[PDB]
Scaffold this active site. Sequence first.
Site, PDB file in Angstrom:
ATOM      1  N   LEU A   8       0.807  -1.202   0.000  1.00 56.97           N
ATOM      2  CA  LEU A   8       0.000   0.000   0.000  1.00 56.97           C
ATOM      3  C   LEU A   8       0.853   1.271   0.000  1.00 56.97           C
ATOM      4  O   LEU A   8       0.430   2.306  -0.539  1.00 56.97           O
ATOM      5  CB  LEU A   8      -0.888   0.001   1.249  1.00 56.97           C
ATOM      6  CG  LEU A   8      -1.794  -1.230   1.444  1.00 56.97           C
ATOM      7  CD1 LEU A   8      -2.123  -1.403   2.966  1.00 56.97           C
ATOM      8  CD2 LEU A   8      -3.045  -1.165   0.543  1.00 56.97           C
ATOM      9  N   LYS A  10       5.162   3.035   1.311  1.00 53.68           N
ATOM     10  CA  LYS A  10       6.540   2.813   1.734  1.00 53.68           C
ATOM     11  C   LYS A  10       7.120   3.949   2.584  1.00 53.68           C
ATOM     12  O   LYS A  10       6.608   5.073   2.599  1.00 53.68           O
ATOM     13  CB  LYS A  10       7.441   2.618   0.513  1.00 53.68           C
ATOM     14  CG  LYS A  10       7.517   1.193   0.013  1.00 53.68           C
ATOM     15  CD  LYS A  10       8.445   1.066  -1.202  1.00 53.68           C
ATOM     16  CE  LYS A  10       8.964  -0.364  -1.353  1.00 53.68           C
ATOM     17  NZ  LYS A  10       9.579  -0.634  -2.685  1.00 53.68           N
ATOM     18  N   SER A  14      10.628   0.937   6.116  1.00 52.23           N
ATOM     19  CA  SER A  14       9.415   0.116   6.205  1.00 52.23           C
ATOM     20  C   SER A  14       8.583   0.109   4.908  1.00 52.23           C
ATOM     21  O   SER A  14       8.649   1.030   4.112  1.00 52.23           O
ATOM     22  CB  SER A  14       8.537   0.604   7.371  1.00 52.23           C
ATOM     23  OG  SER A  14       7.904   1.861   7.114  1.00 52.23           O
ATOM     24  N   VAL A  15       7.814  -0.950   4.702  1.00 49.75           N
ATOM     25  CA  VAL A  15       6.751  -0.957   3.709  1.00 49.75           C
ATOM     26  C   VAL A  15       5.468  -1.242   4.473  1.00 49.75           C
ATOM     27  O   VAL A  15       5.518  -1.795   5.570  1.00 49.75           O
ATOM     28  CB  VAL A  15       6.919  -2.067   2.629  1.00 49.75           C
ATOM     29  CG1 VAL A  15       8.288  -1.977   1.958  1.00 49.75           C
ATOM     30  CG2 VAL A  15       6.686  -3.445   3.250  1.00 49.75           C
ATOM     31  N   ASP A 124       6.334  14.538  13.546  1.00 48.97           N
ATOM     32  CA  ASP A 124       6.601  14.455  12.149  1.00 48.97           C
ATOM     33  C   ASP A 124       5.337  14.504  11.298  1.00 48.97           C
ATOM     34  O   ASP A 124       5.210  13.760  10.300  1.00 48.97           O
ATOM     35  CB  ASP A 124       7.405  13.202  11.847  1.00 48.97           C
ATOM     36  CG  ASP A 124       7.992  13.222  10.462  1.00 48.97           C
ATOM     37  OD1 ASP A 124       8.212  14.358   9.968  1.00 48.97           O
ATOM     38  OD2 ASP A 124       8.204  12.126   9.874  1.00 48.97           O
ATOM     39  N   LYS A 126       2.924  15.470   8.528  1.00 48.94           N
ATOM     40  CA  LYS A 126       3.163  15.828   7.115  1.00 48.94           C
ATOM     41  C   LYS A 126       2.041  15.218   6.259  1.00 48.94           C
ATOM     42  O   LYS A 126       1.234  14.456   6.779  1.00 48.94           O
ATOM     43  CB  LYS A 126       4.550  15.381   6.665  1.00 48.94           C
ATOM     44  CG  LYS A 126       4.772  13.929   6.723  1.00 48.94           C
ATOM     45  CD  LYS A 126       6.231  13.586   6.733  1.00 48.94           C
ATOM     46  CE  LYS A 126       6.361  12.093   6.878  1.00 48.94           C
ATOM     47  NZ  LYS A 126       5.875  11.656   8.216  1.00 48.94           N
ATOM     48  N   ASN A 129       0.988  11.369   6.368  1.00 55.30           N
ATOM     49  CA  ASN A 129       0.341  10.793   7.538  1.00 55.30           C
ATOM     50  C   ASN A 129      -1.183  10.960   7.503  1.00 55.30           C
ATOM     51  O   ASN A 129      -1.846  10.440   8.378  1.00 55.30           O
ATOM     52  CB  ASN A 129       0.866  11.439   8.846  1.00 55.30           C
ATOM     53  CG  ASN A 129       2.364  11.333   9.002  1.00 55.30           C
ATOM     54  OD1 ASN A 129       3.070  12.304   8.819  1.00 55.30           O
ATOM     55  ND2 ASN A 129       2.851  10.158   9.316  1.00 55.30           N
ATOM     56  N   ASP A 145       0.774   6.338  11.155  1.00 51.56           N
ATOM     57  CA  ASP A 145       2.221   6.307  11.362  1.00 51.56           C
ATOM     58  C   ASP A 145       2.739   7.312  12.397  1.00 51.56           C
ATOM     59  O   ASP A 145       2.739   8.512  12.158  1.00 51.56           O
ATOM     60  CB  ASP A 145       2.991   6.469  10.042  1.00 51.56           C
ATOM     61  CG  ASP A 145       4.413   5.901  10.115  1.00 51.56           C
ATOM     62  OD1 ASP A 145       5.094   6.123  11.125  1.00 51.56           O
ATOM     63  OD2 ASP A 145       4.860   5.242   9.155  1.00 51.56           O
ATOM     64  N   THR A 165      10.690  16.267   9.484  1.00 52.83           N
ATOM     65  CA  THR A 165      10.813  16.432   8.038  1.00 52.83           C
ATOM     66  C   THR A 165      11.054  17.926   7.782  1.00 52.83           C
ATOM     67  O   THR A 165      10.314  18.765   8.304  1.00 52.83           O
ATOM     68  CB  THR A 165       9.542  15.920   7.335  1.00 52.83           C
ATOM     69  OG1 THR A 165       9.316  14.556   7.718  1.00 52.83           O
ATOM     70  CG2 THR A 165       9.650  16.009   5.792  1.00 52.83           C
TER      71      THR A 165
END
Lengths: 459, 51, 51
Positions: A8, A10, A14-15, A124, A126, A129, A145, A165
């Site tokens: 779905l 990346k 992680s994926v 984080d 952004k 998310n 996430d 970020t």
Amino acid sequence: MYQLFEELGKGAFSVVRRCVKVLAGQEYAAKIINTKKLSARDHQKLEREARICRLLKHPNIVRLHDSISEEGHHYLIFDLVTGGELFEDIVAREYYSEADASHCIQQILEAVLHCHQMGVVHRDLKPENLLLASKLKGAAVKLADFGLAIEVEGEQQAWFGFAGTPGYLSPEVLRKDPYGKPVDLWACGVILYILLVGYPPFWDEDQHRLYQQIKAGAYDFPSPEWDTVTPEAKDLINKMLTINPSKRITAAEALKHPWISHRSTVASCMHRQETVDCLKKFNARRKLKGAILTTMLATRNFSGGKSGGNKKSDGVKESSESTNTTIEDEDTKVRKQEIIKVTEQLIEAISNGDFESYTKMCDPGMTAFEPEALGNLVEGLDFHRFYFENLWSSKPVHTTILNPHIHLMGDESACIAYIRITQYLDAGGIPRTAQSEETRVWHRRDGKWQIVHFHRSGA
Amino acid sequence: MGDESACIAYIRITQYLDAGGIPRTAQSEETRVWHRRDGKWQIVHFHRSGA
Amino acid sequence: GNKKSDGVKESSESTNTTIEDEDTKVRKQEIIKVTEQLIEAISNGDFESYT
């Protein structure tokens, strides 16, 4: 325990893939973290990530269902949300206004308020998310996430590390100041700004210059595109993009801001096509740029993929390789002979008086011309049943077929015509003989020859 | 022919056995003229041919 | 270019499996057409069209 299906999304480490819990039959998202590629410290802080994500129970936050470590991998299993990114969805919409951006930011702020109340700071925030719950109309926006999230103690500030970020980093993080909850309200100001005009407030090719811009709070509202944005949307952005975190609006206070809480009289209803157009390019520039950090202690080129395979017939079809060749019927028989077979079975069925087998070889709506019908056309098998029941249920009788001709009319149709001669005995024989001229019209229906019509003469 | 009158015509084919059959068949052409009297269909006239 | 509207239609010897499209196409009537033309050809004594 689980079965992995499609990917779905990346990150660098992680994926995420759809998966099904084997014994449940419930579907989830599996965040699959390659622990061989993490620092000892980031591997260890997966314990904190797992913990934070269990704590958080909110309609606008995706929750954790399970956490599993194997030798090279950690698995964090969350609810599946299927709508994809909010930002991708905004550009495919037929209408997008301030009132619609307000509903997005309200949902985000509700989620963030819940984090802050549980002593979690995301750090984080952004566009990546911000996911939609489903593809249904008006699906909720959901936070996904929390890999850089931290736990804080009440309202105490601390130095939790330089993490984030670049475009969304708060001034206090860049000044190396102790920090806390307000870092997330800065990032919401940056997101809100992008939601209104489709481009970020701070951008520079040179990362050092970018950080000076952020620390200075040097963003602007340029014409033409900001001229039609309400003063109240600008006021909320200003309150969030306040350099001094002690003076920055909180998530609770932002939610009471009129552009959010009085949306229906405050937020503009005008479609912003230019925002939609800019956001497309923003979205595209985000998907070329790798999730990779500015630098790290390693020398490996990116590699790895997932291949499918193609389904193949089982067993030994043939010795030489057969790459989908045009196979035909095996060497079984000749079609004319096939018609002869079903015809001989027909004659034998009539001779034996077996109406059961005669029914199978005949179509239920079989058409018939015969002297027993006295020049009339008979439909069905009811008419011949009288002869199967009475007469044929039986002295010696010999049939003889003379001059058979077969017309093949495609794979599914045929017609045979022949002369039938019957030798029999009448009363006290006295052997007798009779001639008839017969036509049968065969038709293969569902892999079986059936008579659709037949014609008889002189019998 | 209205609510109370009707007429049906058809071909009757009879399969039977004579003495020691020997299955036989016979054709006839039949006409029936029906008429509803006091809520009941009754034959007022009928015609048969070739039987 | 050579973009003619009514392009020609020629198949090889193909297999012809059954085709149940939802729309009700006509074919029985087509058979009736060629059959009536047959009867008329026999009646007129036109062996040319009968061939």
